[PDB]
Amino acid sequence: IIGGEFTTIENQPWFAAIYRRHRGGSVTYVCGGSLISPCWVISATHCFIDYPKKEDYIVYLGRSRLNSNTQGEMKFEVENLILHKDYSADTLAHHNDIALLKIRSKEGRCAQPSRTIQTIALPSMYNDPQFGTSCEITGFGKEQSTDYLYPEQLKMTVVKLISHRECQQPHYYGSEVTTKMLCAADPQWKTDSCQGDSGGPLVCSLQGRMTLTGIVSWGRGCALKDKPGVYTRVSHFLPWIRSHTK
Ligand SMILES: N=C(N)c1ccc2cc(/C=C/c3cccc(CCO)c3)ccc2c1
To answer: Per the database record, which ranges form the Peptidase S1 domain?
Structure first.
């Protein structure tokens, strides 16, 4: 996250921290995720497509820091890694950028909801917020595009939804951004999601209800003028999520 503020897991309790174990035993951060039900984390397929072995991943819930065992955190393995069959990547645009991770503690249990571990409600069909709506993003992603290290402390920011017609402008993304994708950005281009924020939540308060409107997917650079962050429109994937979590 470029700009924004530092935060803690208590303010983002649906936030999942996903890491990968490498041969030799080193563990690195991969992407963010969202708890949608106690056994299920939703994220982006692009985060896992090149390393699709479920055994390699570690999921934390209730974790506030990249390298701290936050009090109340829960560690999980991936019981089932579900990648979208129609996932694809163009030069910029990522299509069907959605993944489901069935989580399991070493005792075979799913998440235990607490003050720091909570689910985030899914959107309803054909009911996404209107353009100009403020939404929040959370992640351990880059603070600057020039950084190679991720922040130690979890960050969040607030961005505004951009209409499809504005996002299809030639100086924006033209026809590369589709109706299955949501653009969101800072009108001043100072805050945005960035590399390492992928898979993470775009949470919108809609009709008084805190909703998982999007999933951090793609963008041209980070906090670049006329280059919004592009998010998977979760409302389009309700049949896919339902069928794959049953
Ligand atoms: N402008 C944005 N909001 C935005 C959103 C998502 C982004 C996602 C990336 C992803 C980078 C990436 C993906 C897969 C592998 C790798 C190399 C391993 O570090 C890098 C980069 C910039 C981004 C910028």
So the answer is: 1-246
Is residue 94 among the annotated active site residues? Answer: no
Two structure tokens written together for 218: 């793609």
CA of 232 to the centre of ligand 1 (A): 14
CA 4 to chain centre: 16
CATH homologous superfamily of 13-119+236-246 equals Trypsin-like serine proteases (2.40.10.10)
Q: Rounded distance, CA 112 to CA 205, Å?
A: 24
Pocket lining for ligand 1, CB < 6 angstroms = 46, 192-195, 197-198, 216, 218-219, 222, 229
Looking from the CA of residue 228, the nearest atom of ligand 1 is 1
Experimental method: X-ray
Specify whether the CB–CB gap between 16 and 61 falls below 8 A.
yes
DSSP 31-100: EEEEEEETTEEEE-GGGTTTS--GGGEEEEES--BTTS--TT-EEEEEEEEEE-TT-EE-SS-EES--EE
- Alpha carbon distance 18, 37 (integer Å): 16
For the CA of 197, the nearest atom of ligand 1: 6
**Distance between CA atoms of residues 201 and 132, nearest Å:** 18
How far apart are the C-alpha atoms of 110 and 236, rounded to whole Å?
A: 26
* Sequence ranges of the domains in the chain: 1-12+120-235, 13-119+236-246
